[model samples]
Target chain A: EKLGKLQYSLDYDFQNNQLLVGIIQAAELPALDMGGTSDPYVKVFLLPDKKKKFETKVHRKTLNPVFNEQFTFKVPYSELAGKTLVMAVYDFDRFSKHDIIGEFKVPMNTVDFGHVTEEWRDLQSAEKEEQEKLGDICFSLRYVPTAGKLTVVILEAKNLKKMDVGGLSDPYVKIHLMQNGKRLKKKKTTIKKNTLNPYYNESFSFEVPFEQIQKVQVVVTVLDYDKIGKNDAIGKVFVGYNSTGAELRHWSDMLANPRRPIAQWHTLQVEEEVDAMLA
Target chain B: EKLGKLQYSLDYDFQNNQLLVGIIQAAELPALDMGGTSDPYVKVFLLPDKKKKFETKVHRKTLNPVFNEQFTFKVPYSELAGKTLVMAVYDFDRFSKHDIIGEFKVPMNTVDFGHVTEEWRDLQSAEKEEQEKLGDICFSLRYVPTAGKLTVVILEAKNLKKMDVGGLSDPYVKIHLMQNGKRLKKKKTTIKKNTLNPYYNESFSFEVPFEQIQKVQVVVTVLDYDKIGKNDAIGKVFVGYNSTGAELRHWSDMLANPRRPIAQWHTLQVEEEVDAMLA
Candidate 1:
């Protein structure tokens, strides 16, 4: 098997139905340290179920290091077909933040089970999947022209894209009001942590006169919150004059039936293509 | 002299520039315990500079307890004037929240300095200052008819009402739009802590068509925020069709000059009187 420069061994115990991973040694790793050497350590996780992770001891200041560490996962043989083994090498830092050198993943079903298979594998950059359907967001809208109030209630979102390192996403909803293709106001909901599906029964209201209601458009976007960095946009949907399909129908229903709330589920669209289509 | 039930002694060292406080003992304190007795502790603080606080060990389950705890403060004799010494007794709780028994304040200038003065002081409820002039808020307003945006820039507030446990207050500005004598929309700025004067260069906008501008009135209120209780209103000012004098002049000036921002300093009025006079 053509893997990489990291020679390792792995085997499956049919009796216990456990996956045993052995990290032997690595060679020709690029130096991530500023001093032209690296204190590297290996971390491994079973993907799609990353509850348990294993790490090897740091090998100080070397491009090549030997780590004869053994890790075991209590996974059954029948459930191994969909699991992926992810291995990452990181440069250790005592005072500052650690740096990631590279990583690679292997599908458990592709490996030969019940036997010790060892080979050298080259590390590559962490892989990311192409943009897919993140899921749908459900919300309700109501307008009271006499009171000059427009109320929007964000109900929940389902099957959101996981953006965290631990197989879970901290999700929140953001709503933006646009007038004649220009954004006017924006509001955000509280973040729900460690969940791909979030429920937020929060309502927000804006004072918009009856004459100005026809020119205002609402855009709802789901975002993955990061504490230290900028938040990542998961998906978005537009509901206004430029909206299409379900979004257009929902907006019309709320206006036609005044004083009554109209709730609907709209599939989120990708941010890049959404702007072009909506604009 | 008879103060109350709790007896205490105080002395000031002129040479060393220190204030010495002694918690001698207490008797006949009202029972705050759900049982028959209270586990009470004494807490003392130097007012206006509450950065340092002193507390005595809890006397287990008794209305009459001997503390005899000694505390010292590094305060200069020259700075002792206008300073108040506040002492409080609290009922300690292990499972639930603690309860305040009672407290009292003594002006340092009234004490016989350089000599130990022992007195029996009666505990009394916390004192509060009467309502006073809070000061004025300075802001600018501009309305863009073509863009359908009304922008209000909050510049600053002067001589805000002090509302903290110590002496200063954490203040914020809340702006509400009223239509036909009914509140329509509200917005608020972040709280500036420990100050009676606050500067906030924040801008807020509302999407309103030109035709509906005549129906909107702006009401700006300054409020004092309490962490554990309801926020107290400091003062408020109104600007719109019904506004008179300076408020009316400022609103008419902004609408008269639509493209340029018009800044004004409006004198804040008491909330109770503002409604009566404006209505």
Candidate 2:
């Protein structure tokens, strides 16, 4: 279910506050062109404030392309907290609109600024989920590093994406504990039947080691339970060491003042996009 | 002419005196096994004192492999001038010795250590040439920064590589003025037929802008004319920006004290290994 893999490296220059991105290569890409190969290229962007972008030269007639190009973004160190790096790989077309393969996203907050981290990640596609409007969710996070305990309070949800054919929906919050980008455990709340907005003030706790507190993630999903068939993931939010913007800030606040619960409204990401790392 | 390409990034952490090498990927490797694909991996080494080496995980059944791995070498800042980076790509074997695909070498002196430089270079093979013992050469360099003049004097040679089966070489120094790793101009000394040690003491001048001098390279190759078929390349040396060891220091001396000529004896590289960028 993966398009392939993208290899890249990130470095933040403190003197210039410049984010250096090295688009190294992609491998095992699916062939998209007529010659049993794909003319591939990469487009890089900073999420949330999507203003400017950069691209690598297209490599012709190869499913595996080595794009050893470096791009620099002039970003202040303070603003790095909200920055998210997106690398979108596409099958280039000479005339018509290019066929997009998929994308690999990295939240800058996930990186340790002291060193360079070059890695390969599976390419993920959210083409189907992007068409739908994911609504919003409110959640609170609290952590006690000493006791190795993490708690997540799912307060309520609003304007969730329509999933049930009735035009209304059954909403329940599902919490997944993640570590190192892989899912480990899950728990769900009681379903709220036939409602657009659901208020399920439920709490969930995950036992995490103190040393791994900085590497754990709390993935929350609002799902509409279908009485007759499979449930649809309506909205999703993740708060962790490698989250973006408000999710990152909220997690930091929880860590800064241990045992102090901090709640905030989160713009739900498309469920498909948020759960790409699920096993 | 080209085997394929290797993409990598390099960074020098002055604070830690560490050299960070990011081996991202390789593209278009030749099929070395019966499956029509290669299990490719990369071996990294700091030349001259190659006491320590590192390797990336081998990717199976793929000509192109995305390593996306980082290796660190604890190299002191002062010793960087003499260090050179070698990324050698090889086809991994389970029992027998691994077959080397090629290599991409970067002289430390060539890098502007102020920032990270990620690049893609053509994979080069010197498997045949590596078995032969190449000779050495002596050359002198001078530059007048104010007048924008550059000069190279081919002084002499000693115990040149045997090319004519008589255990002697008809030696001549072929000088090439280069910039940005590509050749621009070439001049050759008169051949001293049937001799191993040739004393040419010939000089060649090239007009170079002071602004472009830092990016220039001077390649000197020793060749033995066959007088029957194709000329055989015997030994080679180069002096200028991005050169290795003595070649690098000799060029630096010319720049450090303008108008003063600096001479040095260089350990000539195997000709096939050095002239991969010939036009």
Candidate 3:
């Protein structure tokens, strides 16, 4: 069965000069025979990009553990206000680097609120044929096009399938576009969750010029995060508009190597629209 | 924090039949507060080629609140004797026609006779951060070259940070290329749960003509298997050869569109070798 939704909150205190976020353990499963280990914990990371720059950790006590706590990160608004922020969570253990279990992400912005949760009600028990539950931690990015903040948002997912509770984990999610990739002068919000019933909700808001912004990207990773094993994945997403109307077709077009699982960093495209969509 | 290793075996007679493989649960994470549900199970699917007509679902299950049992599938050998298999896994409950959890390919001729138990052991854990444990899972896949079997393997997982144990999930593994993606000459085998030290060790084996094969794609998913609220991911691994060195550069080349997330399939390249590295 898929786990329930995970909730978190991210806020910046302009006066305190700090960026604060919370990790909440919304639900839990009845502990099974996990071979032998116990006292499981969760690891959270604040990855700036592909490379992990910062990380944190949390733990649980029972199958239905709940840690509705908040974390205050000492981040200077000047360095974070305009830049996109990506947060990740994992089940971590020192004994084996591969012992990482769960993970999720949230982008930081000003006006929008996106949430991630679990879908438990939809879980199917295996009375006849076995079943699997796949849950997603959604990240919603929203903004108002009228603000003219020149905001650019880039979202990426490393692995797609393994997050489900009981089923295939070949996971892929597409971001809805207001235009090609450029957010218009309106607000955008994304609410995501795993399983069927959502337990978490996170939102982000920002401002952007409805016209100058020409493209955006939603990258996907083709691997699953693991606890007690090395990280593994493949697959990606790239959403945007090309002058020639050409789109991302193969790995080479969007990633450094299609056959190579590692997704390479892509540069965001910015240009003047020769013809306006409205005109 | 980590439920290490998974075992696969023939629950039925395999002498006259081929087995369809599905990852009920590669491994488990204890730290995840899976809302009300826990014990994640995995469903695996095996496909032969680009044709979706011949594909089939071979495996499925639930994890916590239960045992990480391997669900075996029996297929008659006469029909599957010499075929290339495309394998995929997904969540059972929140079946959103879209979200896929894991995907991969395996050739049948190289099938081994023994039972395999994948294992992971904790190396250590830190108390201050949270309840986290590290371990590893070991499994093997072997192949025979003459069959010309092209195997594709995909693995999926949840985000590894926020719900490291609170709610998010992730996957990890080690792969051993008994035969490169380009060519094969003989059959191979895979071992399960062989090591106790925690680190990184998830592997697979297959056979293909090194000369005929030029490129291979290994996709790993770290997104929700169920297409519920929203889906996002973490990372991956893609290995093999890309003759057009420049072709694998940006994210656009790997996807259909900025708004679309699924990758458009491309024919593998069989370019002549420029040079072979001697390790």
Candidate 4:
């Protein structure tokens, strides 16, 4: 019932060995913003070759959008039989995080030749069932009131959720600043592929006034990524004044200590439950 | 006499193996437009490593502007001995091409350690003395009135000027659309390395109505390029209704004969004289 809508057409030319894609339109997309509409755009990918991804123009403030965009992929006939086409729709946000509406994947072997094959497909959400503790992320926070800066140090993550067939996941940490239940700014660390335990040891800084620290929330989400399709959210944790348990303790300690770095290890929570609690 | 003004400071931190650059300010830059000021920015490069180049923020509509921007480069102390620092100032335009104001290069080995070195260097002009016919480019043009598309086929070039020390120059062709002495759109062919006469059968198209073709001027400039440093202009030629001699004749012939491509061989002219003639 939560599925959105997408229509597309695909054709192949034997003489030129070119795969042509047409993104027709979309309808009934799930609202991602506080308003009842969403800014929708389509991202198309030819699998096994994730080096380049094509995207259509964003349709602003609409639940139903007509893209009518065309894209071409140069692939030999021998290689086309094994390749897959992955199309994902995303909600565009200029100042905050871009939310994924849904995605659809099609095997290239099923597509007929010569004529354009068009189909309207259901969009599947990326959410997964809650499993055992994926892992815990170790990080430190330091706030300097004199410089109006907040520094975050990500040390490592242990026992991450496995999403790949080889029992390992390409994991990356996405950090977002939330204010009043809305995300403000976002940044991400480099991806560590084929690892259950990854050490990032990366640092990032945010310029915020001391008086406004009480209104700012830091949400760090761990994601399992595949180059060919949508990335799955493994777990997330929030650190702010309103946060509870270890996150609240960490935030208070950093403020009390001022210039000193306060480090901690927090348990990851299921993304569905996290979103429910926040909402 | 055409040199401009630029001020910068450099420091090497041995402990961090970092090179710190501070672009303080610039002054007395020549106006690029009919207005008496220009939007200017500075680009810095460490030679032999063409992978990364740093740039300063653009100052809007000002001849004399203060930047005070800082940039850092990570290089091992042992590898910094043979490197050179090159900086170029450019005039920024939103809808058109960027023009280089001046440039200067400094050897890093001469800089003293543990202290800041500051300098105000004069910017050198890009104009050069008149030389022999560097090269002649062969190309063809076809105008499709129904689609309002003008197609350009870059066939090849012969007897190109040799700017390299090893008896051959890396040559490329840059095409620009000019109107009222201002550049509007630009495109370029790929660089052919270590060759005086290069063959590049590249095709480009411009969308312009038949009625607007009278106001459009095509400027083709051949340039000598090096991977490490600045690219020098070889020569240029103009073709349009306003163009003189063979260039104008070729443009009229292409329009007079529709669908069929009109090919021409144009002689290269001195860059200084070309600039004077256009101005």
lDDT of 2 by residue, B1-279 (tens): 667888887777777778888787788888654667776777787877543455575565577766656778888888888878988887654322436788888999899876556667998875621223465687778877546789888888877777788568788888888877677898999989888888999999999855457678888888898787988787676766645323454665566555778776765666554664332
User: B3, model 1: CA deviation in Å?
Assistant: 88
A247-277 per-residue lDDT for model 4 (tens digits): 6657765765557898877667777756654
Candidate 4 is graded, for docking, as incorrect
TM-score of each: 0.28, 0.32, 0.20, 0.29
Fnat of the models, one by one?
0.00, 0.00, 0.00, 0.00
lDDT for A55 (candidate 1)? 61
Candidate 2 overall Cα lDDT vs. reference? 0.72
Candidate 3: tens digits of C-alpha lDDT, residues A35-130: 432333333434343321222323323443344334455667667644444333333222212232333444455324222111112122222211
List runs of model 4 lying over 4 Å from the truth: A1-84, A89-98, A101-279, B1-42, B45-279
List where candidate 2 sits over 4 angstroms from the true fold. A33-35, A128-279, B1-234, B237-279
For candidate 1 chain B, the 10 contiguous residues with the lowest summed lDDT are B125-134
lDDT of 4 at A186: 88
Which of the two candidates, 1 or 3, achieves a greater TM-score against the reference? 1
Question: Compared with the true structure, what per-residue lDDT tens digits does model 4 show for residues B121-194?
Answer: 88876532112556788788887654568888887888888889867989999888777798878999999999
- Sliding window of 10 residues with minimal summed lDDT for model 4 chain A: A125-134
Full ranking by lDDT: 4, 2, 1, 3
lDDT of 1 by residue, A18-84 (tens): 8877676777777544588675677677887543445675554567666645677878788898888
Candidate 4 lDDT score at position B122: 83
